[PDB]
Symmetry: C2
Subunit: 167 residues, 2 copies
């Protein structure tokens, strides 16, 4: 039950429901194994830790916010290989951490904000909270700042920033 | 990873944020423990199974839809005895159930729907989807039409219904 500052990355497959319906269980399970293997390797690669969820998408923490951004950037291109797109949100805040041997669980308002940012992210986009932009002030990363808004179900007003990618 | 038709109940503490900051961590952690015990004893009494342990809200599946409704109805009252209120959403749909020995997880559109129904419910209110109302057609449970939300980010039209409890119920 540790209070900690963490960078959390949330990812989700765009149109998972329709891919599963168009491909059928057999082919969908395949794509989902390809996606997971890919995403899990990328996370390991950049030093992240998968933190528990039962909800199809991925959630992982990183001791480095720069690592989280670079990891997200790479995941978007890597999964594109499978013909699907992914949406990604990154946020940093204090969260309650609990690391069992069954995995690590993370909770708190910061976790809800992260999931919210992910939902507001477009296909193949890496959307970040201004908190994360601020944290990596000075890094090589560039952002386009969208307007301020309230993430309903959360205290305060948030400005969201899109990562300037390359392609 | 089997595909099934299940009834899912979602619960959540109203104003947990302000309540936690107001009490401090020790006291809050204690109130949550009592909440969890009560909610859990209730789910067990009605034959439910806790699922997706991540997050501090409660999610449970029931073989019997009427039992999930009766359980929500009881949890609302039982929690009040602690000075807090909960909002509960209930939906039924086809989901992907995966059984590991570290707990059971559920996934699917149905699960998103349920989580959404809960978020829309008010304090001490049990909100369900039209599907749940139709499934228990002819039971003692009564519902009031609460309108038709769109539940975005997921397919469908979707009509919500509030459970008529032995207490003031919204939608009139």
């Amino acid at each position: 039950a540790e209070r900690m500052l963490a960078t959390i990355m949330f990812t989700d497959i765009v149109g998972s429901t329709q891919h599963a319906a168009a491909l059928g269980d057999d082919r969908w399970r395949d794509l989902l194994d390809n996606h997971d293997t890919i995403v899990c390797h990328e996370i390991q690669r950049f030093g992240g830790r998968e933190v528990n969820t039962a909800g199809d998408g991925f959630v992982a923490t990183f001791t480095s916010p720069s690592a989280a951004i670079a990891c997200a950037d790479d995941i978007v291109d890597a999964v594109a290989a499978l013909g699907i797109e992914v949406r990604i949100g990154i946020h940093a805040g204090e969260v309650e951490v609990r690391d069992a041997s069954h995995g690590t669980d993370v909770a708190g308002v910061a976790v809800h904000i992260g999931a919210r940012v992910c939902a507001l992210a477009g296909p193949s986009e890496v959307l970040v909270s201004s908190t994360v932009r601020d944290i990596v002030a000075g890094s090589r990363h560039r952002f386009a700042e969208r307007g301020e808004q309230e993430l309903k179900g959360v205290p305060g007003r948030w400005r969201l920033c899109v990562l300037m990618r390359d392609d």
